[PDB]
Amino acid sequence: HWGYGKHNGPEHWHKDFPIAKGERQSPVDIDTHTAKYDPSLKPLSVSYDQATSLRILNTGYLFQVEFDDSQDKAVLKGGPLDGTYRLKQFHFHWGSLDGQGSEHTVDKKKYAAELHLVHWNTKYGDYGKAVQQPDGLAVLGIFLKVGSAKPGLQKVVDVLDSIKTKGKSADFTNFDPRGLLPESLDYWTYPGSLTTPPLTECVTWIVLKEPISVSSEQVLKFRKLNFNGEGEPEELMVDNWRPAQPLKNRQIKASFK
Ligand SMILES: Cc1cc(C)nc(Sc2c(F)c(F)c(S(N)(=O)=O)c(F)c2F)n1
Ligand code: NA
Ligand SMILES: [Zn+2]
């Protein structure tokens, strides 16, 4: 099965998932000089006031925090988006070293980690139908740099020891994802894909320009997770990022400056 190692990592995925070599793959390098300012884009509307977190899960490839998306609670709209996208979950990708870990890059700069807030287009009724559609998902991407602690991240960090291994979950209620947002909602946007198998080309990417700051100690706790299941040889969950893929004809649009 797929993973991040030499044997089953990103350069192998195309054999099971040929769309890996498709025309709208993610992530990409954001060339800030060739991104076009688009004065017709709207400010992002992030309405997370009624978000209902439920659970945190080690999937074997990352960890994710899941939300109750059975009603229009937390939603993303505006920006490049037509209609309303409902928050389903967030997760992170990160490095073995502070110098790497993000999936998107900015002028080839890698960040220590990248947060993905995943939302589905409510015109498609649920997530499983939305992922079959070319405008099914909107993923809000936020870079993490190592510096000051992010207080809003600590509740996540502190629960990771209870989900060390693949398939472990824990109750994770009353978590407010607004605590993970930077001050500015200036962004880049482009059409792309899931960054893990099945690599479906169903994502409108919205990548915030301003990274959030996390402490070295917070990210080191991400690196103590395990890709393996309990009772199996320990493989640290690090470097679970896909590298930049070819932009091909696509244009990246900037909301700013
Ligand atoms: C592959 C898969 C299967 C299922 C059932 N949910 C998901 S949710 C999800 C996910 F885990 C991800 F890593 C991504 S990502 N990196 O943001 O493209 C995603 F969009 C998602 F929508 N992903
Ligand atoms: Na409900
Ligand atoms: Zn992701």
Residue whose pair of structure tokens reads 């000051």 in the numeric block: 148
| Rounded Cα–Cα distance for residues 144 and 30 (Å) | 16
* Helix, strand, coil abundance in the chain, percent, nearest 5: 15, 30, 55
Q: How far is the CA of 121 from the centre of ligand 2 (A)?
A: 17
Peptide bond into 18 cis (omega under 30): no
Which atom of ligand 1 approaches the CA of 64 most closely? Answer: 11
To 5 degrees, how large is the angle CA 57–CA 62–CA 171? 15
Cβ of 116 less than 6 Å from ligand 1: yes
Question: Cβ atoms within 10 A of the Cβ of 24, count?
Answer: 22
CB neighbour list of residue 47: distance below 8 Å, 6 or more residues apart: 74, 75, 76, 77
In residues, how long is the chain? 257
The 3-class SS string of 110-159 reads CCCEEEEEEEEEHHHCCHHHHCCCCCCEEEEEEEEEECCCCHHHHHHHHH
Does ligand 1 lie within 6 Å of residue 139's CB atom? yes
> Can you tell me the distance from the alpha carbon of 62 to that of 115, in angstroms, rounded to the nearest whole number?
11
The answer to whether 93 is a known ligand-binding residue is: yes
- Elucidated via: X-ray
Resolution (A): 1.5
